[PDB]
Each structure stands twice: as C-alpha cells, then as structure tokens.
Amino acid sequence: ASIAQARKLVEQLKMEANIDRIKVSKAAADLMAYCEAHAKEDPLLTPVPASENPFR
Amino acid sequence: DVQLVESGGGLVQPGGSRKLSCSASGFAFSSFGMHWVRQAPEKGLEWVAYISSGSGTIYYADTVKGRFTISRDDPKNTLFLQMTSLRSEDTAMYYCVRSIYYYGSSPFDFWGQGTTLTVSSGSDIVMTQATSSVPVTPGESVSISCRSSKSLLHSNGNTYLYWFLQRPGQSPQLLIYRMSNLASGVPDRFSGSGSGTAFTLTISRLEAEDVGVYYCMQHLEYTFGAGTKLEL
Amino acid sequence: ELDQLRQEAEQLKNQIRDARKACADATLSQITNNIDPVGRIQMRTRRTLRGHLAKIYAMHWGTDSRLLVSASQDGKLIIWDSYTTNKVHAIPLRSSWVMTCAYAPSGNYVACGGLDNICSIYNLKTREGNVRVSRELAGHTGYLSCCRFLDDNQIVTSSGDTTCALWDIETGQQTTTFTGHTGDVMSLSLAPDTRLFVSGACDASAKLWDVREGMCRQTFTGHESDINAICFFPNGNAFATGSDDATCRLFDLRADQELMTYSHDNIICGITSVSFSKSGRLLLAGYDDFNCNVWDALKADRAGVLAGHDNRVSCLGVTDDGMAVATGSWDSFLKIWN
Amino acid sequence: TLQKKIEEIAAKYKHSVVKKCCYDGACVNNDETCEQRAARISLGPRCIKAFTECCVVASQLRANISHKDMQLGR
Amino acid sequence: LNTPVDKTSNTLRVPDILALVIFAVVFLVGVLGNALVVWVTAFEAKRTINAIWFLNLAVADFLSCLALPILFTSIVQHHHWPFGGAACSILPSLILLNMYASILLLATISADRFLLVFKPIWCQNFRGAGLAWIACAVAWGLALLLTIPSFLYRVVREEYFPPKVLCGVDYSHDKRRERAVAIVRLVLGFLWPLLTLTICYTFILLRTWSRRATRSTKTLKVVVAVVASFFIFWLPYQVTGIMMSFLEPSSPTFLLLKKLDSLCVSFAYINCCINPIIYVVAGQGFQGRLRKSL
Amino acid sequence: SAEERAALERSKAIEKNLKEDGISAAKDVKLLLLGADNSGKSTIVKQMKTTGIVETHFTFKNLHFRLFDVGGQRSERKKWIHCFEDVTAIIFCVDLSDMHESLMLFDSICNNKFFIDTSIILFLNKKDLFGEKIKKSPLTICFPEYTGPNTYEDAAAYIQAQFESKNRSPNKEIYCHMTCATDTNNAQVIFDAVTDIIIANNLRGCGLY
C-alpha cells in the first residue's frame, strides 16, 4: 500500500532526530581551526613561491 | 602472454650480411619502441638499434652505425635488424626488447629469447662494475653495485638507470627501472638505490632463483655495464 | 490511516527543524569577523591542455597531483601529464555523452559514464600496453552524474534515478544501493576517510550516506533549487553544494544544517561544479557565465575570478598537493591554474 | 649615345649660360614639340637656338631609345 | 643657378598628390586591418578550414600593403630607382606577386563559397585543411606565372644629366611583345577573377534565396560589397594597363595616361584596403575576438 | 630534455590521432530525436533500415546521420537535454492518437534557450488513425477551442498551427511534416531539412551571415 513509503519517511525522520547535533559554533571552530592549521600546505589558498611552483 | 621471439641466427661468412627478425605477439606493438640488444657469447650485453613507436625515430650503436639497420612493421607486430658487412665483433646472441615512454612507464619491461649470430674468423656513457663475481649464500642479503661515466640524474628529477638479472641459458629480465621502481612482477626482495654516479641493487633473503649476472644500464642518452656474477 | 502517519511525519519534520534551530546558536558568517581575508586571488593559466575538440564535461586529478583524466563530448577520455601537457593516454569511449570522470586512487583504473547508465572502468596498467575496459558497471536506470573511487575494487556512483550505489568492481554488483532522494542526484563526494559520502539532487536535498550502513545520517534542504555540485571539505565534516539557484551553500554533517550562502546579486548564473583548495579556506565553483569564481568558504565573498573560457566552466578539480586547479569547459580547453 | 652626343654638342658653346641652356634643355621629358615650347622660354637668341637644336636631338634620342617607364605597380 | 624652367618642370603637384594620399589611406588601413585578420585567423583559428582562405588573403594584402613605402617613394622621387638592376628585376616582380595573389585568393574564396552552397554534402568529403592549402598554393603559383614577364624583361636606364636612374621595361627593345604580356595580364589578373566572383555569387544568391531562412538579405549585401568594390577599383587600373601597353609611346593620349597611372594604381589598392574590412565587419563571429584583442 | 623526447613523440602521435578522429567525426551530422512517448520515434529509424540513450546512425547518399533518441531514459530534462546543444536539428515527432503533454513538450523544446537557433523537424505521425479519430469522434474533445469542421484537412492544419505557433523566435524554422508512415519519404524530408541547415551553417561560417 502507498502508506508504506510515508511510514518509511517517518522512520527516517525519527532516525535523523535521534542523530546528534553539536552547536554550529563548534563546527565553525572546526573549519576555521582546520584552515589555520593547513594553510601552509595549500599554495592556492596562500600565494605560491615563484620558483617552487611545479608549473613554473 | 607476451612474446618477444627472434629468428635468423646461425653461421654467416665474415663480410656478409644477415637479417635478424623479431616477431612479437600479445601486446599493442604499435605503442612501443624496440631495441635489438645483443650479448657476446661469453661477455656482457651491448646496445645495437632502436626503432621507435610508429617508426618515427631511430638510433644505432656507434660500433654498428650504417652497417646495421633496423625496421619495424607494426601491422605484423615485427621488428627487424638488417646487418651488413659482418665483423667478428657482430657474433652475439641478439635479444629483441620492448619499451614504452610516458609518465611512469617502464622501458625494457620485456626481453626476447635470443638468436645466436656467429661468423668465423675473418662523448659516450660507459658503465662499470666494481666486481665481476661475488659468492652468495641462500637467505643472505646481496648488495650489487655499478658505476657509470656520468651522472644519470636528469633535470626532471629522474635517475635513468635500469637493473637486469640473467640466469644461465635464460633471457634477461628487468628488476628495477629508474633505480627505485620495481618491475611488474619482480619480487619485493630486490630493491635499488644510488646517487651521483654510484649505483646499487639490494636483494634480501636471496633464493636460489636470484643467482645470475646483474647487468645495470643507463638510458639518459642513446650502455650496459659489465655485470657481476653471483655464485651460489 | 495515511492522514495520521502523515501528521506524524509533519510533527517529526517540525521537531527536527526545531532541534536543528536549537543547534543554531551561531553561524560562521558572524564568527568570521575575527579573521582577515586571504586577499585577492589572481591565479593565471600556467598551462592549457588544448587537445579536446568538443565540450569537456568532467575532469579528475590523479593521486600524484600531476596526471589528469578528462571526459568530453568528443568521445575521447584523454588523460594528461599536466607538467609536459602530453596526452599520455587517449581512451576511445563507448559513448560521447559522458558526464563523469574518476581517476582511481592508485592510478591503475579510470572510470567514465553518463547518459548510457553505465560506469565503465578502464585498466591503465595492462601488461599489453594499452588502456582497456575492466568493468561495465551496468545496473542504474538513470544517467550517471558523478563517480568516485573508494579503492581500486569498489566505486560509488550517483545517478538520475534518485539513487546512489556502491559497487564491487570485481563482480559488478552493488554491494549497497542508496535510495531516498525525491529528485535526481547530480553530484557526489566521498569523504577523505572513505567512510561516508554526500550527494545532492535536483530536489535541493543533499545528504550524507554512510557506506557500510546505507542509512542517510543527515538530510540538508537549505537550497531553493536543484543541487548541481557536491564536494567535501578537506576535514571530512563539512561539505559545500552548488545549484541551478545560481548560488552555493556550505553544510556541516555534525551540525546538520547550512552555514553560508555563496550568492552575489549579479551572479544569476547556475553552478556547474565545485571543489576545495587543500586547506579548505578556498571554495572553487564553476559557473555557467563563462568563468569560475574562487570564494573564501569561511567568508563567502568572491576572493577572485578565474575567467578565461569561451563557454561554460563545466568541471573543476584541485590537486591533492594544493598547487593547481583545473577548469574544464565547453570550450574544450582544459585550463590549469596556479 | 645620348650623353656623349649632348656633351659634344654643348661643347660648341663658349659660355656657361649656353652650356646650362643645352644641358638642361636636353630634358627628354615627353612634353610635345619643345620647338614650340621655346616660345615660353625666356633666353637670348643664342640660347634659344641652342635649346632648340639640343632639344630636337635629345627628343630624337628619347624617341628611338624605346624604353617604357612602367611605374613599379605593374 | 639651377632654375629648371627650360621646357617643362614642376614640384610634387599634379594629381599624383591624390594618388599619394590614396596610398596613405590604404597603408593606414592595411597596417591595421589585415594585421588584425591575420592575428585572429592564425591565433584563434587555423584549426578551422574557413580561416585558411582569409589568412592567405589577409597575408597577401598585408605584404602588398607593406609594399606601399616603395610605391609612395617612387611617386615622390619621380620614379627614381636607386637599387641595382637585379633589384629592378625582382622587387617590382614580387609586388605583382602579392597583388595578383590577393586577386586570385578572392576568386578562389568565391569558388569555395560556391562549393559550400552548391555541394554542401560533398564538402563533408572534400573540405579539409589539405585542399584549402592546395588551392591557396595554386593561387600563389598563378600569381608568380603572371609576374614572370617583369621577372624577365625588367631593365634599368639612365638620364645621365643628373644622377637620375630609373627602372622600366625593354620589350626586345623595339618589337611587339608587350601586347602578349598586357593581354594575358588583363585576362588572368582581372577578367577571369571578375567573372568568377560575379558568376559564383549570382549562383549563390539564386540558390541561397530559394529556400526559406537562407533569404537573409546579408548574402546579397556581402556579394554586392565584394563584386561592386572589386569592379570599381580594379577596372581603371586594368583598362589603363592594356591601353598603355597597346597605345603608342607618345602623343597626348599616352601623355595623359602617364599623368593618370599613379592614381589608377592608388585606386586599385583600395581593394587591398577593403578586403580585410569586408570580412571583419560581415564575419560578425569575429567581433568578440576583435574586442578581446585589446 | 632527457629521453622524454620519446614521451613527447608519443604525445604527438596521440594528438595527431585525436585530430584525425575529429576531422572524421565532424563529417557526421547530429540529430536529436525528441518527442512524446510512443510518438513513432522508433518507427522512423526502423524504416531507415535501451534503458539509457540509444544513438542509432545511418547514411543517406553521402551524409551520415547520428540520430539520438534521448527520450528513452527519464529524468529532469533540463539535466540532459542541454548536452545536445550543437545538434543540427531536433527530429521532434508527435502521435495524434491522444495529449497536451506533447504540445507542452514542443512548447518547451522549440522555445528552449539551448535550441533557440536550432531548427526543428516536426513529424505529425500516424495521420491514418488521426483521420479515423476525427471520423469517429469530434476533434473538440482533444481541443475544446476548436471551431472548424472535423474534415481531415482543416483539423490537420489546425493542429499543425497549434504546434508551430508555440515558436517564440523567428530565426528558426519548423519543418512540420505529415508522414503517415510513408516509406523512405520521412528520411528524404529529414535529409532536405538537414541540407538546408548545413547550407545555412556553411554560409554562416563564411561570414555571409
């Protein structure tokens, strides 16, 4: 019957409800701290040295 | 099932001519260069010829230029060496070989069976080995070495050296290419390293299958070293 | 009755929306005031891979950050040595309508597919010397929109039948089939950890699927229109989406909601693909308006523009070494930038 | 021929004025019948005679030389 | 004391001045123009067949235009020719090479358009860079064959009074050979091209405006732009050429022609001026490229 | 350079092969066979003598057709119709056994920005059963707006006008044709429209447009 897929949606939504939520502040901290940690390894996000460039 | 197989050997009168033939199968011949490398009946390997992919480029050994000419016919998956005005120095077992050149490819990845050309009596990159023989015992670790006249580390970062193993009565085999990279089938027991002009190959946990002559080779400019014979 | 469980569905959706709001104590757009921009990006074409002759649709870097694969309408899947511009291989495709490239993490395999419903896999390192079909991964009902390798044996596919799938390349059967979009799936991105992958569909809903347990761990619905690009943030916790809404947004898998909208008033043009720089600071998105933009993910401003294409910038990838971004286009010239 | 003939004919005249008068009147340009153009040249009768003779011989030379002056575009 | 009044003399006056200024206009446009066309047709094109013809036409016109300092000076220096006899035998030959290369390239462009509009399916068996290059090479070969008579009969002669030395022609010094030269030059350099343009573009219009949605009015506008300008600019030069070759070496008629020839040449060069402009303006696909060039 | 000269040589061979394949692929003419379900898309190609795209191809006196039937696979059309931009013509066809979803499909295709300057060939298929339909029932049931008689010519012209009126741009042309499954005539009309189209594009390349 057509009700089955709606029941599936209900169950999926409950599973998502049971999922955990951190505060968005913590996620923003995660991303910004990751950027400040890994900037030195990203010669696009920070200018490349002219002579080190592999495409120089 | 790759096959490099050659035919056309035997006796030839000095001053004559003979055409060695290489009849390959099991791979896209057209994509590959070919070299008709040869080995003296009791000595080391020697370069002879070079037919490129699609026959677009060709070189010869200084000891055979003009005398020896090579020709490739892709639709028949065959390479030829036409030798003219044969000298005693031309007597050797001739091995057809295989190569492909692109980022990360393994030149000389396959070698032929060998044809015995024999005749009766009638500014270069040399390679040298500090040892002609070394006694080895199974399970031990053997460290081969060779040295070439010039540094093989090109500008692009590659050191263009290759390591081959020859067992008795057997075709030569590639172990390492560009001195760090294992061939697709060589066991991880073998491993190469080197720098400058000093060049080595290490084999740990030597099995009996690793006995033979470890010829090194250069490829920076279009030769083989003398090779050291490991004794069981 | 259906009305009762539909009411329960509405209640559950309202409750999870309420909890999602409860997690929204802040947003990065208001935290980022404490940090400075990267300044203007002005990257220029250090190479141009002018071999293609009809509308490169997709491209993907190899793990070595030097080789490429590029699929185009031409019917050729020609793979580049980026440094020397050499066409090291050129695979004659089964179909010219390929929308997807995948370059295996080991470099041994490449896969490609599109309107033919098939994720064909090509083995590059054959002893025979030429690239050849390893697998025809037939079994989707819609077209394919993205492919990514987890490892040389199992690949994940996104398709237009509203399902993703994870395959066993050794037998060609879907070890897991992922369903639960209402629209059709346009893009896909394995996490760096290879444990979870996100996808986005034209119903504006993007979600993270765990590959072992195929359950969607979070559904994201901030977009007004079809999701067209997907890519994970390098840390594997956040991901960003591009859409025909002429805008991108950033999502977080542990906060389960949107953080930034990547929209400027003058860009009324859809987004064809997205990717991140190695540090995640820079989000690179290819627009329909003949150019890509590069935008600070933490700030959403356009840090720079990588215009220079005669047509749509249809695909985009960034090296693992973080020293180059490719921008394929319907102009058929693959610009490589730094 | 022309240069030697003109030089020798001009040598007949014992004044710089007559020398000029022939040497410049010899101009081989194709303006018709310089014998009539002499009416438009102000000079003494001696120079007029020198001009007329010098010009008639110069015009004969220019006529018989049979060289066509195509102007480099053809 | 060097008052030049004897017989006839003049300064840089005479309509030679109008010829000079027409050369100036064509030079300004051709240092521009054809330069732009060659830049686009090479850099942004030459992977496309239909840029081969326009590259060749633009380069031929460009070289013909860079020939203009020589002609301009030959005017203002009253046809004095400093260079040696071999220079008189060669440079005034390569100039005609470039000009007739331009003309024959217009003719073969017209024939190419004719095939593109009358053998459209078969052009997707013919059309390809190879045959385009072959046709352009044949155009250049014809231009050399039409240059040869200046490659043989050129000579240098002198006045001996000043240092005045000039470059001309001696047709066996005194005999009827000029007529064959001028006749074949007229035919192959102007009339056969004129017929090619007119016939082929008339056929194009009479089949372009048969079916709908090819009745764009721009085919007629451009066909007129080509044929009308070609006829207008080349007819004076060519009729004056045949006339000055047949007509006797003197008398008021040939004198009047020696006054008007410079203008006739400067007027033919208007076709070298317009050949780039017509396809810059009509080929509106170029507009983006042209704007992006600066 | 080191022996990487051989790498550049093989790169040159591959690039030359790509060009040789390109100048052998552009000879074929691309057609998109849009249309509503069961409209006769398969029939026209069959007389020419599957879960995703099918790209049947054939030749007709020195012209090779790539004739894509993109309609066999269902997803949002805005995501895969845009691939076929740069196709020479849409071979749109319609079946009159219905149906306004076909009218709506045409109103989409003929107006689509990716086909703004792309010609369309409209095959009004199975006229035979259209005549039977109007003979057995009034056309008003299909078009309440219809005021003309139920005679074949008037009704057919009316529906043809309904379709071609959905054009929003004058530059394109809609080569509507009432095929009635006539053998080899549909291929002839496809060819004639395509010949017009490629004369147009040749002429437009030359700078005459």
CSV table of C-alpha atoms in Angstrom, one decimal, chain B residues 102-105 177, chain C residues 60-69 77-81 88-89 91 101-111 121-127 130-132 134 148-155 169 320:
chain,number,residue,atom,x,y,z
B,102,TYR,CA,55.4,8.2,-20.9
B,103,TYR,CA,55.0,9.4,-17.3
B,104,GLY,CA,55.7,6.4,-15.1
B,105,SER,CA,56.3,3.8,-17.8
B,177,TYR,CA,63.7,0.9,-13.5
C,60,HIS,CA,39.6,14.5,-12.3
C,61,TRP,CA,43.2,14.6,-10.9
C,62,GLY,CA,45.2,11.5,-10.2
C,63,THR,CA,46.6,10.9,-6.7
C,64,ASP,CA,50.0,12.0,-7.8
C,65,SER,CA,48.7,15.6,-8.5
C,66,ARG,CA,50.3,15.6,-11.9
C,67,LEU,CA,48.2,13.4,-14.2
C,68,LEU,CA,44.6,14.1,-15.2
C,69,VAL,CA,41.6,12.4,-16.7
C,77,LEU,CA,38.8,10.2,-22.4
C,78,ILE,CA,42.4,11.6,-22.9
C,79,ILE,CA,44.5,11.6,-19.7
C,80,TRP,CA,47.2,14.3,-19.3
C,81,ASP,CA,50.6,14.6,-18.0
C,88,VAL,CA,49.9,10.0,-22.2
C,89,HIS,CA,46.8,8.0,-23.0
C,91,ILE,CA,40.9,6.1,-24.4
C,101,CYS,CA,35.3,11.0,-14.7
C,102,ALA,CA,37.0,9.0,-11.9
C,103,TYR,CA,40.8,8.5,-11.6
C,104,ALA,CA,41.5,5.7,-9.2
C,105,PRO,CA,43.4,6.5,-6.0
C,106,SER,CA,46.2,4.1,-7.1
C,107,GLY,CA,46.2,5.4,-10.7
C,108,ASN,CA,45.6,2.0,-12.1
C,109,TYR,CA,42.0,2.4,-13.0
C,110,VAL,CA,39.8,5.1,-14.7
C,111,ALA,CA,36.0,5.0,-14.9
C,121,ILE,CA,36.0,1.2,-15.8
C,122,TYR,CA,39.3,1.3,-17.7
C,123,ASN,CA,42.5,-0.5,-16.6
C,124,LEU,CA,45.5,1.6,-17.5
C,125,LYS,CA,48.5,-0.5,-16.4
C,126,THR,CA,47.9,-3.5,-18.6
C,127,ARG,CA,51.0,-5.5,-19.5
C,130,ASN,CA,47.0,-0.1,-23.8
C,131,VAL,CA,44.1,1.0,-21.7
C,132,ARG,CA,41.2,-1.4,-21.7
C,134,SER,CA,37.9,-3.6,-16.8
C,148,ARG,CA,34.4,8.4,-7.1
C,149,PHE,CA,36.7,5.5,-6.2
C,150,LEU,CA,37.0,4.4,-2.6
C,151,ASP,CA,39.7,1.9,-3.6
C,152,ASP,CA,40.7,0.0,-6.7
C,153,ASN,CA,37.9,-2.5,-6.1
C,154,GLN,CA,34.8,-0.5,-5.0
C,155,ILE,CA,33.4,2.7,-6.6
C,169,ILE,CA,34.3,-3.8,-9.3
C,320,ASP,CA,46.0,16.9,-3.7
